[PDB]
Amino acid sequence: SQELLKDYIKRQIEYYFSVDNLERDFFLRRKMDADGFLPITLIASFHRVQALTTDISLIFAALKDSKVVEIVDEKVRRREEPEKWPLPP
Ligand code: NA
């Protein structure tokens, strides 16, 4: 139920941080800081995520113990070599 919704949110956000998406998603990379971090609330504003939920606790929960992304406080980044992806804003 909410477990199912969490799975869709997880797969969607993990896609944003995939190499396949990152090679072409210049908007996302222009929003990263130098360590590759993005605000989780920015991800929450993306159309395909906001359609699924506006519950920020559910969005955080979907990403807990992800093998693709790392959460530090309010920010999220790709786990593997995040620093290679940021672009000038
Ligand atoms: Na936003």
Curated annotation (Swiss-Prot):
Sequence ranges assigned to domain HTH La-type RNA-binding in this UniProt record: 2-89
Signal sequence annotation: none
Posttranslational modification: Phosphorylated on multiple Ser and Thr residues in response to active mTORC1. Phosphorylation is important for interaction with RPTOR and the mTORC1 complex. Phosphorylation promotes dissociation from the 5'UTR of mRNA molecules with a 5'TOP motif.
Inducing or repressing factors: Up-regulated in a number of hepatocellular carcinoma cell lines and liver cancer lesions, as well as in patients with hepatocellular carcinoma with a lower survival rate (at protein level).
Coiled coil regions, renumbered to chain: none
Function: RNA-binding protein that regulates the translation of specific target mRNA species downstream of the mTORC1 complex, in function of growth signals and nutrient availability. Interacts on the one hand with the 3' poly-A tails that are present in all mRNA molecules, and on the other hand with the 7-methylguanosine cap structure of mRNAs containing a 5' terminal oligopyrimidine (5'TOP) motif, which is present in mRNAs encoding ribosomal proteins and several components of the translation machinery.
Quaternary assembly: Interacts with PABPC1/PABP. Interacts with EIF4A1. Interacts with RPTOR. Recruited to the active mTORC1 complex via interaction with RPTOR. Inhibition of mTORC1 activity strongly reduces interaction with RPTOR and the mTORC1 complex. Identified in a complex with mRNA, PABPC1, EIF4E and EIF4G1. Found in a complex with PABPC1 and SHFL.
Family stated for the protein in its record: Belongs to the LARP family.
Domain-level remarks: The C-terminal region mediates interaction with the mRNA and polysomes. It is required for translational repression of mRNAs with a 5'TOP motif. The N-terminal region mediates interaction with PABPC1.
Protein name, entry field: La-related protein 1
First and last residues shown, out of full length: 400 to 487 of 1096
